[PDB]
Write an enzyme that holds these catalytic residues in place. Sequence first.
Site, PDB file in Angstrom:
ATOM      1  N   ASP A  12     -14.521 -33.398  20.563  1.00 37.21           N
ATOM      2  CA  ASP A  12     -15.547 -34.620  20.807  1.00 37.21           C
ATOM      3  C   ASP A  12     -15.784 -34.523  22.245  1.00 37.21           C
ATOM      4  O   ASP A  12     -14.894 -34.387  22.950  1.00 37.21           O
ATOM      5  CB  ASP A  12     -15.243 -36.042  20.147  1.00 37.21           C
ATOM      6  CG  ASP A  12     -16.251 -36.554  19.894  1.00 37.21           C
ATOM      7  OD1 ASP A  12     -16.744 -36.809  18.657  1.00 37.21           O
ATOM      8  OD2 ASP A  12     -16.749 -37.318  20.741  1.00 37.21           O
ATOM      9  N   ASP A  58     -14.381 -37.941  29.064  1.00 31.03           N
ATOM     10  CA  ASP A  58     -13.555 -38.542  27.912  1.00 31.03           C
ATOM     11  C   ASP A  58     -12.439 -37.474  27.368  1.00 31.03           C
ATOM     12  O   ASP A  58     -12.182 -37.553  26.338  1.00 31.03           O
ATOM     13  CB  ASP A  58     -14.054 -39.321  26.809  1.00 31.03           C
ATOM     14  CG  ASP A  58     -13.343 -40.344  26.086  1.00 31.03           C
ATOM     15  OD1 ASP A  58     -12.306 -40.528  26.359  1.00 31.03           O
ATOM     16  OD2 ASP A  58     -13.978 -40.742  24.924  1.00 31.03           O
ATOM     17  N   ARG A 100      -6.978 -37.896  21.551  1.00 27.89           N
ATOM     18  CA  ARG A 100      -8.068 -38.452  20.635  1.00 27.89           C
ATOM     19  C   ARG A 100      -9.292 -37.818  20.300  1.00 27.89           C
ATOM     20  O   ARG A 100      -9.748 -37.894  19.191  1.00 27.89           O
ATOM     21  CB  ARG A 100      -8.135 -40.106  20.940  1.00 27.89           C
ATOM     22  CG  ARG A 100      -9.027 -40.343  21.898  1.00 27.89           C
ATOM     23  CD  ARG A 100      -9.320 -41.786  22.328  1.00 27.89           C
ATOM     24  NE  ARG A 100     -10.153 -41.994  23.644  1.00 27.89           N
ATOM     25  CZ  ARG A 100      -9.059 -42.360  24.626  1.00 27.89           C
ATOM     26  NH1 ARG A 100      -7.894 -42.662  24.774  1.00 27.89           N
ATOM     27  NH2 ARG A 100      -9.752 -42.266  25.785  1.00 27.89           N
ATOM     28  N   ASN A 101      -9.502 -37.010  21.125  1.00 29.76           N
ATOM     29  CA  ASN A 101     -10.773 -36.227  21.233  1.00 29.76           C
ATOM     30  C   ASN A 101     -10.598 -34.713  20.677  1.00 29.76           C
ATOM     31  O   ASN A 101     -11.337 -33.971  20.919  1.00 29.76           O
ATOM     32  CB  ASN A 101     -11.829 -36.591  22.402  1.00 29.76           C
ATOM     33  CG  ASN A 101     -12.351 -37.935  22.756  1.00 29.76           C
ATOM     34  OD1 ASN A 101     -12.622 -38.556  21.570  1.00 29.76           O
ATOM     35  ND2 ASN A 101     -12.304 -38.522  23.731  1.00 29.76           N
TER      36      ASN A 101
HETATM   37  C1  B9C Z   1     -14.853 -40.160  14.778  1.00 24.90           C
HETATM   38  S1  B9C Z   1     -13.839 -39.556  13.861  1.00 24.90           S
HETATM   39  O1  B9C Z   1     -14.026 -39.893  12.546  1.00 24.90           O
HETATM   40  O2  B9C Z   1     -12.392 -40.242  14.280  1.00 24.90           O
HETATM   41  N1  B9C Z   1     -13.497 -37.884  14.101  1.00 24.90           N
HETATM   42  C2  B9C Z   1     -13.249 -37.312  15.105  1.00 24.90           C
HETATM   43  C3  B9C Z   1     -11.466 -37.492  15.288  1.00 24.90           C
HETATM   44  C4  B9C Z   1     -11.193 -36.962  16.474  1.00 24.90           C
HETATM   45  C5  B9C Z   1     -11.727 -36.037  17.172  1.00 24.90           C
HETATM   46  C6  B9C Z   1     -13.214 -35.699  16.935  1.00 24.90           C
HETATM   47  C7  B9C Z   1     -13.869 -36.384  15.885  1.00 24.90           C
HETATM   48  C8  B9C Z   1     -15.178 -36.111  15.751  1.00 24.90           C
HETATM   49  N2  B9C Z   1     -15.494 -35.535  14.338  1.00 24.90           N
HETATM   50  C9  B9C Z   1     -15.076 -34.495  13.794  1.00 24.90           C
HETATM   51  C10 B9C Z   1     -16.033 -33.363  14.289  1.00 24.90           C
HETATM   52  C11 B9C Z   1     -15.278 -32.248  13.628  1.00 24.90           C
HETATM   53  C12 B9C Z   1     -14.007 -32.032  12.781  1.00 24.90           C
HETATM   54  N3  B9C Z   1     -13.794 -31.120  12.016  1.00 24.90           N
HETATM   55  N4  B9C Z   1     -12.528 -31.802  11.172  1.00 24.90           N
HETATM   56  C13 B9C Z   1     -12.676 -32.946  11.337  1.00 24.90           C
HETATM   57  C14 B9C Z   1     -11.677 -34.095  10.824  1.00 24.90           C
HETATM   58  C15 B9C Z   1     -11.628 -35.150  11.118  1.00 24.90           C
HETATM   59  C16 B9C Z   1     -10.738 -36.185  10.540  1.00 24.90           C
HETATM   60  C17 B9C Z   1     -10.066 -35.408   9.599  1.00 24.90           C
HETATM   61  N5  B9C Z   1      -9.163 -36.557   8.873  1.00 24.90           N
HETATM   62  C18 B9C Z   1      -7.495 -36.251   8.908  1.00 24.90           C
HETATM   63  C19 B9C Z   1      -7.000 -36.851   7.967  1.00 24.90           C
HETATM   64  N6  B9C Z   1      -6.908 -38.350   8.355  1.00 24.90           N
HETATM   65  C20 B9C Z   1      -8.446 -38.619   7.835  1.00 24.90           C
HETATM   66  C21 B9C Z   1      -9.315 -38.091   9.094  1.00 24.90           C
HETATM   67  N7  B9C Z   1      -9.955 -34.492   9.569  1.00 24.90           N
HETATM   68  C22 B9C Z   1     -10.701 -33.312  10.044  1.00 24.90           C
HETATM   69  C23 B9C Z   1     -13.809 -33.422  12.363  1.00 24.90           C
HETATM   70  C24 B9C Z   1     -14.213 -34.424  12.899  1.00 24.90           C
END
Ligand code: B9C
Length: 282
Positions: free
Chosen positions: A167, A149, A153-154
């Site tokens: 991701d 994937d 977005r990842n």
């Molecule tokens: C599944 S999700 O909630 O969309 N998280 C996500 C999004 C894009 C890529 C990967 C993920 C997986 N979760 C994840 C893992 C490690 C991370 N470190 N920092 C984040 C993170 C995730 C989101 C974030 N924001 C940015 C401000 N808008 C709200 C969300 N800021 C930092 C993060 C997320």
Amino acid sequence: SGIRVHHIKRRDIVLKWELGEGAFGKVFLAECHNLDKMLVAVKALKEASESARQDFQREAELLTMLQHQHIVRFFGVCTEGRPLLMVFEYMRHGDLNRFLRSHGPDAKLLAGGEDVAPGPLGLGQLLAVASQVAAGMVYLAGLHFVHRDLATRNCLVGQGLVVKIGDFGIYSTDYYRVTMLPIRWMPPESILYRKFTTESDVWSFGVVLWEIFTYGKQPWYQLSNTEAIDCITQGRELERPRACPPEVYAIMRGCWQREPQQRHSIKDVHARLQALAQAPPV
Ligand SMILES: CS(=O)(=O)Nc1ccccc1CNc1ccc2[nH]nc(-c3ccc(N4CCNCC4)nc3)c2c1
């Protein structure tokens, strides 16, 4: 016998608020003590499976041993009570796709932060993001790791446009409802023969490269999932983006060869990308 996964005390993690939701569950911003206080991202699984308790240890093991410079930093887990938690570093800009979109022509000057100008990015900035993602894919290709994937977005964006893969492995048009397939990023050998190798990831990276230069536009956004499958399998390629120099497009067209053996390796795409990044044509 396997990979020693760092366990974190639940009392050393104070959840601030939800940052987002995914298939796996919810992500939160939190403070972590004794890893000095420190802000981190925490994943919480929706669980309700004994199998999902297995995939948790799997992912935690792969993440713990795949630590590198362009892969999101994983700090450890918390199995001390439901819900299971994965602690990572906090990338203040969130996913690469939303970041790109917030610096695109429709976004005017609504991008924030103190680290990057609002509005469009420099050519050298676009190639920096591209090169950082390629370098993460080179490392994963080294360990025979196949990303099924690969998409903006990842990926995650941190302070100072540090881009990492965030991701690895259900309502967006990115995924085709069948197993969910992000067909729009898939090479013909994956749609037709169900094959996905390192070379497949090189084709996917080309689409990521296209996403980056369109400011996160969806591939074949005008077409349906089946129409996109027709294009991909008939040899129709994405149009060069307005904001794309021919030397980058050429890199893109190198990933989009029907024959996987006729695609440049990911180490060569990185190399060509790093070069231009240090010398953006403009
Ligand atoms: C599944 S999700 O909630 O969309 N998280 C996500 C999004 C894009 C890529 C990967 C993920 C997986 N979760 C994840 C893992 C490690 C991370 N470190 N920092 C984040 C993170 C995730 C989101 C974030 N924001 C940015 C401000 N808008 C709200 C969300 N800021 C930092 C993060 C997320």
